[PDB]
Each structure stands twice: as C-alpha cells, then as structure tokens.
Amino acid sequence: PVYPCGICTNEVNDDQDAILCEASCQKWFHRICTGMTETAYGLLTAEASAVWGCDTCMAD
Amino acid sequence: PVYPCGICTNEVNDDQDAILCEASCQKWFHRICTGMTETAYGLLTAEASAVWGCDTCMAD
Amino acid sequence: ARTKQT
Ligand SMILES: [Zn+2]
Ligand SMILES: [Zn+2]
Ligand SMILES: [Zn+2]
Ligand SMILES: [Zn+2]
Numbered sequence: 001p002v003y004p005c006g007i008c009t010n011e012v013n014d015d016q017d018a019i020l021c022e023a024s025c026q027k028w029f030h031r032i033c034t035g036m037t038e039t040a041y042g043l044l045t046a047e048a049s050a051v052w053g054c055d056t057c058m059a060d
Numbered sequence: 061p062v063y064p065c066g067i068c069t070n071e072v073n074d075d076q077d078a079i080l081c082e083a084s085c086q087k088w089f090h091r092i093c094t095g096m097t098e099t100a101y102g103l104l105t106a107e108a109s110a111v112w113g114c115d116t117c118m119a120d
Numbered sequence: 121a122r123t124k125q126t
Contacts, residue, residue, distance in 0.1 A: 013124075040103055047100050050100075
C-alpha cells in the first residue's frame with residue numbers, strides 16, 4: 001500500500017530486492033517482477049552513476 | 061564528425077569501449093577514462109533501461 | 121541506481 005510495486009502492486013519491503021525508476025515514474029519495482037537477474041541488480045546497486053527506468057517509462 | 065572523449069578529449073573509435081552520457085550532455089567517454097570496470101560497462105551498454113551520466117551531469 | 125539494498 002505504501003510502496004506498491006509498479007508491476008505486481010504488492011508491498012515493496014526493506015528486505016526485498018527492489019529498484020526505483022529514477023527515469024520518470026519514481027515507483028519501486030521488485031527485481032523479480034521486472035525480470036532482472038541478481039547479477040544485474042548487484043551491479044546497478046554498485047554504479048552510483050547508473051539510472052534505471054521501468055519498461056513503461058522507457059517506452060515513452 | 062569526430063567525437064572527443066569528454067575526459068581526455070581524444071578520439072572515440074569503434075575499437076574502444078565507450079559510453080554515452082544519456083543523462084544530459086551526450087558526449088562520448090572512453091570506458092577507461094571514466095574508471096568504469098568492464099563488467100559494469102557490459103551491463104550498462106547492453107541494458108537500455110540503465111542509462112549512464114558523467115560526473116559533471118550527475119552533480120547536476 | 122537507487123535500490124532497496126541499503
Ligand atoms: Zn512486485
Ligand atoms: Zn517508471
Ligand atoms: Zn578518453
Ligand atoms: Zn554528461
């Protein structure tokens with residue numbers, strides 16, 4: 001309810017792998033929901049210079 | 061046309077790992093000049109959802 | 121990229 005996943009609409013907790021769409025919509029998306037591998041996720045967390053965007057925002 | 065690296069001002073050629081600052085300025089940067097690893101680079105260039113920004117553009 | 125891993 002507070003942080004609805006942009007795909008499954010379920011709650012995005014602190015102990016779950018999730019990524020914010022800094023590209024536009026500013027919504028949180030579960031890593032698993034977006035179909036992102038743990039390897040991609042870890043690198044994205046490591047790269048402060050990288051900005052991620054959801055399929056919806058990127059298709060705009 | 062020529063594309064000077066945003067850091068070293070040297071030419072960015074096809075046989076060099078280079079990344080585009082899609083965040084704003086849109087200058088090309090040699091992967092080596094940015095200090096980015098090959099693994100981080102591979103993920104960024106392959107993933108369209110993940111866009112990169114140079115130090116200048118990231119600091120706004 | 122901003123992630124929950126913090
Ligand atoms: Zn989800
Ligand atoms: Zn989005
Ligand atoms: Zn360079
Ligand atoms: Zn830039």
